[PDB]
Design a binder for these strands. Structure first.
Ligand SMILES: [Cl-]
Ligand SMILES: [Cl-]
Ligand SMILES: [Cl-]
Ligand SMILES: [Cl-]
Lengths: 216, 461
DNA sequence: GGGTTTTGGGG
């Protein structure tokens, strides 16, 4: 049994075509998370891993006007509760976004959250980036392997075997190794992008902007 | 003139900076504690302080601790191997919970210098380069380091002592680590001494070590390529500070922290020697994973001939995108590489073996049966790897056996697969294993007319 | 010092 709520949640999302509706229902209950950091990166934990929640402009407007005496970027070390939330896959640049892997990111879309300040959370293990976990990275690789195999089997069709004469009696033959490069998909660009999952599009608020709204 | 004092003889009273030479047996990785402070903690010994009092029969190591403080990461020593020697200038000494703790503020006036006990430092071994001299420190704090002619005897004698010590004692005694089969019983972090059975390149930044210790237990752990570039299959290492991963269901995983360290042992190490011979891989995890629909652990399906066991590996990125523009790559025709198979052609396994007419250099289906020439394999793998993980490409690797290359890859002698059901079945099973997620191939290839053909490699499953 | 940064895949 998976003890990390975030790991089990994110893994199921990747193991179900990035379709949140296909994710088990008994895991869609409100999340009680400890805030590890609030700025420059707002990171919450579940006692094992930390993830970066994405707040909708509505979730923020509700929080501001339901808890006006509370600054979100001042929630470090504070415990929050996410009542309304969803999950969705997004294509990202992993060289820039540390909360992702292999250019893929499972985002926690927050629609409603309340702060349970002054509530001491039970000590635990030091939280690590879920997207740096051995098994989770592997789960994401499986997802890409599936998409890669589907595309290659769709793109490469019929006979494409190197003619045996080309590798026989090759003593006087020379070739360029780039002859062995086969495109996995008809797509444009050096990066593989022929996935079949429905990429999320939920517009979220950038953390550096919730800072100005709250602290100029 | 610097006066060097032995560890047990250093003064606990004089307010004052002392200097010494010592053998490093353990060390954290240099780590940050706050916005302007880095620390590296080391366990050190010398002829006067190295073993605890025993009215019995199991020798436990005695040591002093050295705590180096600095304001920059670069001012601290990165210890990759137990047994090397450190020289410290201007350290203070005090008792910390009954033990001798030498402290040194590298940011103020203290300094350190590392000397290799073996002929080459870990870094020099990695890049295959001789040392300047036996008296030259391979690493040191500040812009300069001076070795006085009178010091030479201290270094040479300590080196001789270090080898006698490591070859006569375990050094890293049983009280300094936890058996992997008991890792789950630990309350917090612990240390490990294990053999690296495999180094799996998970991605361009990360290695995954498959470890096994004296208890027979297997665990996997992530190891950044930049941080620990000295990890090698078959070598014994001590891991300083690992935690049992409670969230790993599919496989046994150890979690490392920024302060954790993976260190090897100098050649003379009795412990490393004994563990290298005693510990072996039986592939239990791999065999069990093959029965699962999805394996979260990698399975290296093949092994290369012993004559290539020492051959260095080349990535697909290099093999296919640089082999015609890199001086070193253009100089070779034989390479070793690792990859996973995305697709196998022809799709029909029955057509993997064809008849070959040497005279016309043409192959043909055996479905018509009766001698179309010598039977050969004509299989093509479309492969991918860590170095090409994100691109939109797959790479052709061939198994064309007309001249012997790769003949026994499948452990199935070429035969008419339309007629021999036994051979066909073995090959169908192999195909499914080869295209299964997390299955990898470790193969030696020969470049021929722009193509890479597998040779001297065989499946082990 | 047997420890917990951000350089947020050395730190
Ligand atoms: Cl992948
Ligand atoms: Cl002191
Ligand atoms: Cl080194
Ligand atoms: Cl060539």
């Amino acid at each position: 049994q998976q003890q990390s709520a975030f790991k089990q949640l994110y893994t199921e999302l990747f193991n179900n075509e990035g379709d949140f509706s296909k994710v088990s229902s008994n895991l869609k209950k409100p999340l009680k998370c400890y805030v590890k950091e609030s700025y420059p990166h707002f990171l919450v934990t579940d006692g094992y891993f930390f993830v970066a929640p994405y707040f909708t402009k509505e979730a923020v407007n509700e929080f501001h006007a339901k808890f006006p005496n509370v600054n979100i970027v001042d929630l470090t070390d504070k415990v929050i509760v996410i009542n309304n939330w969803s999950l969705e896959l997004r294509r990202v640049n992993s060289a820039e976004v540390f909360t992702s892997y292999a250019n893929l990111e499972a985002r926690l879309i927050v629609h409603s959250f309340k702060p349970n300040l002054q509530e001491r959370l039970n000590p635990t293990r030091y939280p690590v980036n879920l997207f740096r976990d051995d098994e989770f990275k592997t789960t994401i690789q499986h997802f890409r392997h599936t998409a890669l195999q589907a595309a290659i089997n769709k793109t490469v069709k019929g006979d494409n075997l190197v003619d045996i004469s080309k590798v026989a009696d090759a003593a006087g033959k020379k070739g360029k190794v780039d002859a062995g490069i086969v495109k996995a998909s008809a797509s444009k660009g050096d990066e593989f992008s022929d996935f079949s999952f429905k990429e999320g599009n939920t517009a979220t608020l950038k953390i550096a902007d919730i800072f100005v709204q709250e602290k100029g | 003139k610097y006066e060097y004092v032995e560890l047990a003889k250093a003064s606990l009273t004089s307010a004052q900076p002392q200097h010494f030479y010592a053998v490093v047996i353990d060390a954290t990785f240099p780590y940050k504690t706050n916005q302007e402070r880095y620390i590296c903690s080391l366990k050190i010994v010398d002829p006067t302080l190295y073993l605890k009092q025993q009215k019995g029969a199991g020798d436990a190591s005695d040591y002093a601790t050295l705590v180096l403080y600095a304001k920059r990461f670069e001012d601290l020593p990165i210890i990759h191997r137990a047994g090397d020697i450190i020289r410290v200038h201007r350290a203070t000494l005090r008792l910390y919970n009954g033990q001798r703790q030498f402290n040194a503020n590298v940011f103020y006036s203290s300094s350190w210098a590392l000397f290799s006990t073996d002929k080459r430092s870990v870094t020099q071994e990695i890049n295959n380069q001789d040392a300047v001299s036996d008296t030259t420190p391979f690493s040191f704090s500040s812009k300069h380091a001076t070795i006085e002619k009178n010091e030479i005897s201290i270094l040479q004698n300590l080196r001789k002592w270090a080898n006698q010590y490591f070859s006569s004692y375990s050094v890293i005694s049983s009280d300094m680590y936890t058996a992997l089969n008991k890792a789950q019983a630990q309350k917090g972090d612990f240390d490990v001494v294990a053999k690296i059975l495999q180094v799996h390149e998970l991605d361009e930044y990360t290695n995954e070590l498959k470890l096994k210790d004296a208890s027979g237990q297997v665990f996997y752990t992530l190891s950044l390529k930049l941080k620990f570039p000295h990890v090698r299959t078959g070598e014994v290492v001590r891991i300083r500070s690992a935690t049992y991963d409670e969230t790993s269901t599919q496989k046994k995983v150890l979690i490392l922290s920024h302060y954790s360290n993976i260190i090897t042992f100098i050649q003379s190490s009795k412990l490393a020697k004994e563990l290298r011979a005693k510990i072996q891989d039986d592939h239990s995890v791999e065999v069990a994973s093959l029965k699962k629909n999805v394996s979260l652990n990698a399975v290296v399906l093949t092994e290369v001939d012993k004559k290539h066991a020492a051959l260095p590996s080349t990535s697909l990125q290099d093999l296919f995108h640089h082999a015609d523009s890199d001086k070193e790559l253009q100089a070779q025709d034989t390479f070793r590489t690792q990859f996973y198979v995305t697709k196998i052609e022809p799709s029909d396994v029955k057509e993997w073996v064809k008849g070959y007419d040497r005279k016309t250099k043409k192959s043909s289906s055996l479905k018509g049966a009766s001698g179309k020439g010598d039977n050969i394999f004509q299989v093509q793998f479309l492969v991918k790897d860590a170095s090409t993980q994100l691109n939109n490409n797959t790479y052709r690797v061939l198994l064309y056996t007309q001249d012997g290359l790769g003949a026994n890859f499948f452990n199935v002698k070429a035969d008419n697969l339309h007629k021999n059901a036994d051979a066909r079945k073995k090959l169908e099973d192999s195909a499914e294993l080869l295209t299964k997620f997390n299955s990898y191939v470790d193969a030696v290839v020969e470049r021929r007319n722009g193509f890479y053909l597998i040779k001297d490699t065989k499946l082990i499953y």
